[PDB]
Design an enzyme around this catalytic site. Structure first.
Site, mmCIF file in Angstrom:
data_model
loop_
_atom_site.group_PDB
_atom_site.id
_atom_site.type_symbol
_atom_site.label_atom_id
_atom_site.label_comp_id
_atom_site.label_asym_id
_atom_site.label_seq_id
_atom_site.Cartn_x
_atom_site.Cartn_y
_atom_site.Cartn_z
ATOM 1 N N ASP A 1 0.854 -1.167 0.000
ATOM 2 C CA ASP A 1 0.000 0.000 0.000
ATOM 3 C C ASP A 1 0.900 1.231 0.000
ATOM 4 O O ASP A 1 2.053 1.184 0.450
ATOM 5 C CB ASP A 1 -0.944 -0.044 1.211
ATOM 6 C CG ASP A 1 -1.548 1.328 1.569
ATOM 7 O OD1 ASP A 1 -2.337 1.885 0.775
ATOM 8 O OD2 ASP A 1 -1.258 1.841 2.674
ATOM 9 N N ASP B 1 -0.059 4.949 0.810
ATOM 10 C CA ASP B 1 -0.253 5.967 1.841
ATOM 11 C C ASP B 1 -0.108 5.351 3.237
ATOM 12 O O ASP B 1 -0.806 4.386 3.576
ATOM 13 C CB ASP B 1 -1.618 6.641 1.665
ATOM 14 C CG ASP B 1 -1.742 7.395 0.327
ATOM 15 O OD1 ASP B 1 -1.317 8.567 0.241
ATOM 16 O OD2 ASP B 1 -2.294 6.833 -0.638
HETATM 17 O O1 LIG Z 1 -3.726 4.446 2.186
HETATM 18 C C1 LIG Z 1 -4.262 5.202 2.987
HETATM 19 N N1 LIG Z 1 -4.064 5.147 4.366
HETATM 20 O O2 LIG Z 1 -3.214 4.160 4.835
HETATM 21 N N2 LIG Z 1 -5.146 6.265 2.721
HETATM 22 C C2 LIG Z 1 -5.691 6.794 1.541
HETATM 23 C C3 LIG Z 1 -4.810 7.615 0.800
HETATM 24 C C4 LIG Z 1 -5.143 8.212 -0.400
HETATM 25 C C5 LIG Z 1 -6.410 7.967 -0.894
HETATM 26 CL CL1 LIG Z 1 -6.954 8.654 -2.394
HETATM 27 C C6 LIG Z 1 -7.296 7.175 -0.211
HETATM 28 C C7 LIG Z 1 -6.951 6.596 0.989
HETATM 29 CL CL2 LIG Z 1 -8.185 5.655 1.716
HETATM 30 MG MG LIG Z 2 -2.614 3.173 3.234
#
Ligand SMILES: O=C(NO)Nc1ccc(Cl)cc1Cl
Ligand SMILES: [Mg+2]
Ligand SMILES: O=C(NO)Nc1ccc(Cl)cc1Cl
Ligand SMILES: [Cl-]
Ligand SMILES: [Cl-]
Ligand SMILES: [Mg+2]
Lengths: 396, 396
Positions: B183, B185
């Protein structure tokens, strides 16, 4: 915590020593920096490098708690204020495999002596197999530069003492191999297909003599192929299927491939033999890649010629690159296993070159040599133990 | 040779014990069946299971040669006619990783107790890291069926004692993993790209609240994406590049990818974020696969909408299969690392699911959880030691 303390428990293994020792340490200011424990033939060693307040390190309470608990149950315990002692041992630079049937104490002593001579430290010895061959592993730390000299010593030891001895780099990179190619004739498969074919023409005699000369590096492989296949001129093409059916896999071949599939290997064969024989087995063995020569046929009869590019000594290396390109595997992660001089270039191009019951010409250039009629001893050189093979096989 | 004898040397390590012992054994009828040796904190154990004639096994000569040579130099030696003793130990069924900063003796004792309670035997303990976190490994033999109960115990231990504790199958198969997806972010990358974007609109407040709710499993991921991206309506598309430039990798991220490239891993990212940000880094990091959402743009301005299929919770799993199909890697050899509920399906579909500084919703379903702000602790759960990372990195 201020300072480091080293606590070393040794003696006859008993249930619950590990837990007991860490309950005691928890009654003090103790954090763990390093812990190593093993039981070898009911001998326990437990080495605990620990972090506690200077208040606690130089007070008799810590020592007395540990000393009382350990000695009560019949073990010995050391407690020394280290501070300058390494935290975690460094990794071995190399690993050395010793296979024999048998391995004499003399053989193993010669290995140990050749090692100790070069300044090479032994970090671990474990058994990797009791079957089909006795296999032992030495993880070693080789002084920079002695790499080359040590391989020669152990090659002299190998032949003088009648064990296989292979020295492999034990680095992260060189360990994650992922592609293996096998020569077919007298490697993956017992015997020589061309001799089986030459028999149907009553030519097995001449054909086996030339094959011996070619595999020993006595004759050019291209000319030797052309001379031997020529003896097949006039045989019906029906004979290909028959010889195909006669093929006996090398003992442990199936175990070898199954185990390599478990490890995620890409697997192929590269032979100077004939695609029409090899392809049946390539399919049966779910192989990923086959490079092979091609028998010419005319009105359903063989002519005595092969077609197109002859996969020669250089062509076997070329095929392994093809395979490793199609497979996205760097040549340094590739394994080639062969028995003849036919194979010298393949082995030398591969990250690991394994000569398997091989003529002297190939042993001399190989990264490692195997002397026993079991192809699964290839697994042991790839970091696999017999017990791991048996365990995974049992699961199924 | 007729019968088996066990020879166990122990005491303070000294140069040349190994060689000396096998010279002595060679003066008798001795063949090796098994050899295990290690030195832990200058404590040597050398366990030699041996094969010699009944003539030699029950005669005082063998015993006296060994006993004299070993004791002369300050070690102890045992010699027992075994015969019924195992030849080579069986492999561990599982391995248990303990990471902490710190690891208290109490924490480790709780692990050892939970283990010993379930009938789980400890086969080896070694340190896998002193940096950035203290890491310890327990190779264990778990009684059939206790697999599940042991993971729960150690999850209770983990949280009560403030260490990460992961139980992995230590089989041949489940060990040769080959594909990892991250992942983006708050996993590969610090922070939330959508929060960085939402800031440029003066919406970082609302946007971070919704992100928290979505990542905790409070809100549907699709609706949460649509609500947060809507706050970007009207920003120039120029802002994508700017936010791209602000990105800080997770500490140890680069070490993690470099090390995984050394092991031959296929590497990709799977995010609900935005391909136009992620692709710059995917290229920089030489990544093999990127699945991501897509910002809608009109006359160079963002609309507040995303295009096409939203990569939702289920879509993150779908992408990992795509990746593992394109890569010819069975799902059981795949690794997924994530931090949010966004990731629950990815982790659960992966062979190894690693929750990384993750909300409770994900920890509860993960195969293993990491609690420290270093992404390279992922390596330790993949069988890599700190010293191996340092050694390979040094080579370059
Ligand atoms: O990965 C994530 N947190 O760990 N967050 C996240 C980051 C950018 C977007 Cl567009 C949507 C989400 Cl849900
Ligand atoms: Mg994330
Ligand atoms: O692989 C071989 N020996 O190990 N021999 C061999 C077998 C078949 C053919 Cl066509 C040609 C050769 Cl050189
Ligand atoms: Cl053919
Ligand atoms: Cl985008
Ligand atoms: Mg051959």
């Amino acid at each position: 915590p201020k300072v480091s303390v080293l606590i070393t428990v040794t003696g006859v293994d008993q249930p619950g020593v590990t837990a007991t020792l860490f309950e005691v340490l928890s009654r003090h200011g103790v954090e763990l920096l390093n812990v190593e424990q093993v039981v070898i033939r009911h001998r326990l060693t437990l080495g605990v490098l620990v972090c506690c307040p200077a208040d606690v390190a130089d007070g008799p309470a810590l020592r007395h708690d540990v000393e009382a608990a350990i000695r009560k149950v019949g073990l010995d315990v050391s407690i020394e204020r280290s501070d300058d002692v390494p935290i975690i041992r460094e990794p071995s630079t190399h690993t050395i495999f010793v296979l024999g049937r048998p391995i004499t104490a003399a053989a193993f002593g010669a290995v140990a002596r050749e090692v100790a001579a070069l300044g090479v430290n032994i970090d671990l010895i474990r058994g990797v197999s009791d079957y089909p061959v006795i296999g032992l592993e030495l993880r070693v730390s080789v002084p920079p530069g002695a790499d080359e000299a040590l391989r020669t010593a152990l090659n002299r030891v190998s032949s003088e003492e009648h064990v296989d001895v292979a020295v492999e780099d034990y680095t992260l990179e060189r360990r994650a191999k992922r592609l293996i190619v096998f020569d077919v004739d007298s490697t993956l498969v017992q015997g020589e297909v061309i001799e089986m074919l030459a028999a149907k023409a009553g030519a097995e005699g001449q054909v086996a003599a030339i094959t011996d000369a070619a595999m020993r590096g006595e004759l050019d492989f291209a000319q030797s192929l052309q001379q031997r296949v020529a003896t097949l001129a006039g045989l019906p093409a029906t004979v290909i299927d028959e010889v195909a059916g006669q093929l006996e896999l090398m003992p442990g071949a199936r175990t070898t491939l199954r185990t390599l599939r478990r490890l995620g290997y890409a697997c192929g064969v590269v032979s100077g033999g004939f695609r029409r024989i090899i392809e049946p087995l390539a399919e049966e063995l779910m192989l990923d890649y086959v490079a092979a020569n091609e028998l010419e046929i005319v009105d359903g009869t063989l002519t005595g010629r092969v077609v197109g590019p002859i996969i020669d000594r250089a062509g076997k290396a070329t095929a392994l690159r093809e395979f490793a390109q199609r497979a996205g595997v760097p040549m340094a992660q590739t394994v080639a296993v062969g028995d003849g001089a036919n194979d010298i270039d393949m082995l030398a191009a591969a990250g690991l070159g394994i000569a398997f019951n091989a003529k002297p010409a190939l042993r001399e250039v190989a990264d490692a040599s195997l002397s026993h009629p079991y192809l699964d001893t290839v697994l042991f050189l790839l970091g696999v133990t017999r017990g791991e093979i048996e365990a995974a096989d049992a699961i199924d």
